[PDB]
């Protein structure tokens, strides 16, 4: 399954999972400080991912700075 | 499934999910402040995505600035 | 499934879904103001998409300007 | 499924769906004025598409000017 | 399924569908005037396509002028 | 399925289908005059194709001149 | 299924089908005179093809002169 | 399945597996000293991976430094 | 299935099929005179092919002169 | 399945298999002397691989020196 | 299935099949004199191939000289 | 299935198969003298391969000298 790579360029970046289904709610958040990385899949329960704060993002479609 | 990457260049960007099926309405709007990103899939419930406001958008077919 | 990316270059763009099946009718029209984007799939209900107004379009086959 | 992208270069372009099956009949027509686009799939009902008038056409096999 | 793109360079181009099966005959002829285009699939009923008249032809294997 | 594109460079080209199975016989011969094209699939019935006369041929493997 | 393209560079080229199975026998031959072409598949009954005489041969692996 | 390659550039890197499902918890943290590498898959149990500390990361989408 | 293309550069080339299964023996030898070609598949009965004599050989992995 | 190639540049490299499943522990350590190589798959039992010591590592995503 | 191409550069090359399964034994050795080629698949019975003597080898991963 | 190509650059190279499953044991070794090659698959029984001694190794991921 598809995934995203998220690296914090500054402290306090939040990576938020949004629920799959008829409803769209916050189900989990991970905080990244500068330099920390999360590699996160889309899953049965997560169909959208929100990132708050300055991050470097890589997906199958390229880089989002 | 396919997805889209949307980064807000200005405050107040709305990323809107439109319902899959015979009927079409907005089922969710995620508001992004400047710099925030959403990576969102097409899903059982979402078959079109509308973006209002100045955003950087990436899909399987490249970039839309 | 395949999808199309449509960006309005000027106010008053309409993105129209045509019904899949023996009958062909417009089932939904989405208005886009300048700068707004819709990323829309072909679906069980939609097998053709009509775009009226000045728009930038991307598909698997490239760009229409 | 495969699809075609058709943009009218002049007013009065007609995009015509032809029936799949033993018989080949016109089952629907869409008119495009200058700059208007249709993105249309081949489907259960449609196995050939006819275009009358000056149009820019894109398919999986390239551009037909 | 595979398809062919045929554009008439002169009036009176005929695009002819030949029947799939043990027997081979012409089940349909679509006449194209100059500039008109047909995008036609191979199908349950059509396993060969004949073009008479001056036409620009595109397939999966490139162009035929 | 795989197909062949055949264009007659002179009058009197014949495109001949050979029967699939234990037995091999000509089941159909299509005459092509100069400039005429046939796009023909391999099928349940046809597992080899013979071309007589001066023709331009395209397949998945390239061009024969 | 895979196929081969065979063009006679001289008169009297023979293209011979060999049987699939425990036994390897000649089951059919086609004669090509100069310029004539056969496009022939491997099939349920043919698992090897022999060519006698000067021919230009194209397969998925390239050209054999 | 998809995997990640993580190399510690300094001592004290932690590679953390997050649980797949409705709940998201850290189920394992692997410490890496300078120069040590982990190559870790996404799995039935693990649907996101967090990396803390200065690390070189490679995925299908390229490198993070 | 995969195949090999073998052209005799000299008279007396032998193309030998070796049996698939626990036991290995030659089940067929096809003798090629200069210029003759065999295009031969791997099959239910043939899992290795031996060529004796000077031949030009092409496979999925390129040429062997 | 995916695999990794690991070559020891110094004596005492350990290649460690981590268990697939809810629990994570080290089920095997292969010690490599200088120049020795292990080519190791991900498997039913191994879903992460840890390398301690100076090694040259290759995976589907390139080299890690 | 995958295969290997082996050409003897000097007399006395041996191509040896090793048995698939819990046990590993030589089940067949084919001698190749200078210039002779074997194209051999991996099979139900053969899961490793040993080549002794000076040989040119081609596989999906390239050439060994 | 995936395979590896191993050529001995010096005498006395040992290629060792390690068992698939909960246990990781050596089940077979092949010795290669200078210039000798083994092409070995991963299999039901073998999920890791160890090489002792100076060898040239090729896999799907490139060359390991
Ligand atoms: N338990 C979550 C873990 C997860 C995966 N991707 C995420 C993105 C954001 C937050 C959490 C996650 C899930 O399986 O869906
Ligand atoms: N619950 C929504 C979440 C979602 C996915 N993609 C979206 C695009 C826009 C808005 C919401 C979404 C869904 O599963 O469909
Ligand atoms: N990328 C996957 C995510 C996924 C995993 N399991 C799922 C089950 C149902 C729907 C989606 C999923 C998909 O869109 O398919
Ligand atoms: N409810 C519509 C939403 C949609 C998808 N693509 C579209 C294109 C145009 C208009 C509406 C749509 C559907 O699932 O089919
Ligand atoms: N791209 C997928 C989206 C999707 C995921 N799960 C679905 C379930 C039903 C319909 C569509 C979906 C599709 O068109 O199929
Ligand atoms: N491009 C898809 C559209 C689609 C999604 N779900 C469907 C269900 C039925 C028919 C078509 C669809 C297709 O042609 O298959
Ligand atoms: N109802 C038509 C819609 C359509 C798709 N492609 C077309 C091309 C031309 C005209 C109509 C169409 C169908 O499903 O087949
Ligand atoms: N009814 C025809 C339509 C058609 C498709 N391709 C064609 C080519 C030529 C003529 C007609 C056709 C069919 O389904 O087969
Ligand atoms: N390109 C598709 C067109 C198609 C869509 N839905 C279909 C249903 C039946 C037959 C054909 C189709 C095909 O020929 O396969
Ligand atoms: N009825 C023939 C039509 C055909 C397809 N390819 C051909 C090539 C040559 C001659 C006839 C054909 C068939 O289905 O097989
Ligand atoms: N290219 C397709 C054409 C096709 C569509 N629907 C079919 C139904 C039966 C036979 C052929 C077809 C094929 O050879 O299969
Ligand atoms: N190229 C196809 C031709 C084909 C279409 N339908 C078939 C049915 C049976 C045998 C062959 C066919 C094949 O070799 O398979
Ligand atoms: N009836 C033969 C036709 C054929 C296909 N490929 C060939 C090559 C050589 C000779 C005959 C053939 C068959 O189906 O097998
Ligand atoms: N009857 C043999 C024909 C054959 C195919 N490939 C070969 C290679 C060598 C010799 C004979 C063959 C078979 O089906 O297997
Ligand atoms: N990348 C795989 C991970 C995986 C392996 N086995 C699984 C079983 C269930 C769910 C996920 C998995 C996936 O998303 O599918
Ligand atoms: N190239 C095909 C030829 C083929 C068609 N039908 C077959 C039936 C059995 C064996 C082979 C075939 C193959 O090797 O599979
Ligand atoms: N009977 C052997 C033939 C064979 C295939 N590849 C080989 C490599 C070496 C020796 C023999 C073979 C088998 O089917 O497995
Ligand atoms: N390349 C095919 C050869 C093959 C065709 N038909 C077969 C039947 C049984 C075994 C092998 C075959 C394979 O290894 O599978
Ligand atoms: N037992 C864990 C091992 C694992 C795989 N990938 C990981 C990433 C981080 C931490 C642990 C792991 C699992 O199968 O899921
Ligand atoms: N890469 C494979 C590893 C694997 C092999 N056999 C397995 C059995 C069960 C689970 C995983 C595996 C996978 O994730 O699927
Ligand atoms: N490369 C093939 C070899 C093979 C052919 N037939 C087989 C039957 C059983 C096991 C292996 C095979 C594989 O690993 O699958
Ligand atoms: N009998 C062993 C043969 C083998 C394949 N690859 C190997 C690598 C090393 C040693 C032995 C092997 C097996 O099937 O697994
Ligand atoms: N018995 C182990 C062998 C193994 C494969 N990959 C490994 C990586 C590290 C250590 C051991 C292994 C297994 O099948 O999983
Ligand atoms: N690369 C193969 C190895 C393999 C061959 N045969 C197998 C049987 C069972 C498990 C693994 C295999 C895989 O992991 O899929």
Author numbering:
A (entry chain F), B (entry chain A), C (entry chain B), D (entry chain C), E (entry chain D), F (entry chain E), ...: 7 to 71
Task: List passages from the publication reporting this PDB structure.
Here we examined the factors that define the oligomeric state in a circular protein oligomer by studying the Bacillus trp RNA-binding attenuation protein (TRAP). Studies on B. subtilis have shown that when TRAP is activated by bound tryptophan, it can recognize and bind specific segments of RNA. When the tryptophan concentration is high transcription attenuation occurs as TRAP, binding to the leader RNA region of the trpEDCFBA operon transcript, induces the formation of a transcription terminator hairpin thus preventing the establishment of an antiterminator structure. When the concentration of tryptophan is limiting, TRAP is inactive, which allows transcription to proceed into the structural genes.
Previously determined X-ray structures of B. subtilis and B. stearothermophilus TRAP revealed 11-subunit oligomers with essentially identical architecture. We hypothesized that the 11-mer to 12-mer switch could be induced by withdrawal of the C-terminal amino acids from the subunit-subunit interface, as observed in B. halodurans TRAP. Such a switch could be engineered by simply removing the C-terminal amino acids starting from position 72. The conformation of individual subunits is also very similar, with the main chain r.m.s. difference with the B. halodrurans TRAP (residues 8–65) of 0.38 Å and 0.33 Å, respectively, for the engineered B. stearothermophilus and B. subtilis TRAP. The engineered 12-mer TRAP share almost identical intersubunit hydrogen bonding patterns with those in wild type 11-mers, Tables S2 and S3.
